[PDB]
A paper describes a structure:
Peptide deformylases (PDFs) are enzymes involved in a pervasive and essential process called N-terminal methionine excision (NME). During NME, PDFs catalyze the removal of the formyl moiety from initiator methionine, found at the beginning of all prokaryotic translation products. We provide the first evidence that some viral PDFs, including the shortest [name] identified to date, [name] [name], display deformylase activity in vivo. To conclude, characterization of the phage [name] [name] allows us to unexpectedly uncover the crucial role of the most unusual final amino acid in fully compensating for the 30 amino acid longer C-domain to ensure full deformylase activity.
To gain insight into the properties of these novel viral PDFs, we determined the X-ray crystal structure of [name] [name]. The crystal structure of the protein could be solved by molecular replacement using the structure of Pseudomonas aeruginosa [name] without its C-terminal extremity as a search model. Two crystal forms of [name] [name] grown under different crystallization conditions were used. Superimposition of all chains showed very similar structures (r.m.s.d. of all of Cα < 0.5 Å). The [name] [name] structure is composed of two α-helices (α1 and α2), two 310-helices (η1 and η2) and seven β-strands (β1 to β7) organized into two sub-domains between which lies the active site. Moreover, [name] [name] lacks the α3 helix usually found in Type 1B PDFs, as expected from sequence alignments. Unforeseen, [name] [name] is also devoid of the conserved η3 helix. Several metal cations could be identified in the structure. Particularly, a zinc cation was identified within the active site, which was coordinated similarly to other [name] structures, i.e., by Cys of motif II, the two His of motif III and one water molecule. Interestingly, the two final residues of [name] [name], Thr136 and Ile137, lying very close to the active site, are involved in a network of interactions unseen in any [name] thus far.
Numbering used by the authors: 1 to 137
Write the structure that this text describes.
Amino acid sequence: MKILKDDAPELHAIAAEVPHGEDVKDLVLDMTAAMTAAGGIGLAGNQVGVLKRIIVLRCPTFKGCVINPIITRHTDGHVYSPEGCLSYPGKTVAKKRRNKVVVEGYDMDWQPITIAAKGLTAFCLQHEIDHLNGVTI
Ligand code: NI
Ligand code: NI
Ligand SMILES: [Zn+2]
């Protein structure tokens, strides 16, 4: 796998929902390995040229993948979140984020999962889900 250059069109494209039960274990393994090899804590399909709704995270309160992630709950208003991104080396942006979120989706074995997160972990979930919608910092 390769983390695509900052001018890759995939970064603006929409990731396709994964058909329920599709075997994506190798994809998840590859994305996880690319994320850690590059020293990151989050990665989305688009960033490695995989236009599928898959994110991987290595965050303080969640480590693993989410397939077909959706945000189902969040706190009102916003807080400041300084963020970088493996697709944009050297760039940090002060983003407005929800302080707390609930994310729902599937793990690699297609077990339904629910992730309640605050602070850094919540910011990462928002950032990575944004990627699947072609939204970048
Ligand atoms: Ni590779
Ligand atoms: Ni661009
Ligand atoms: Zn990113």
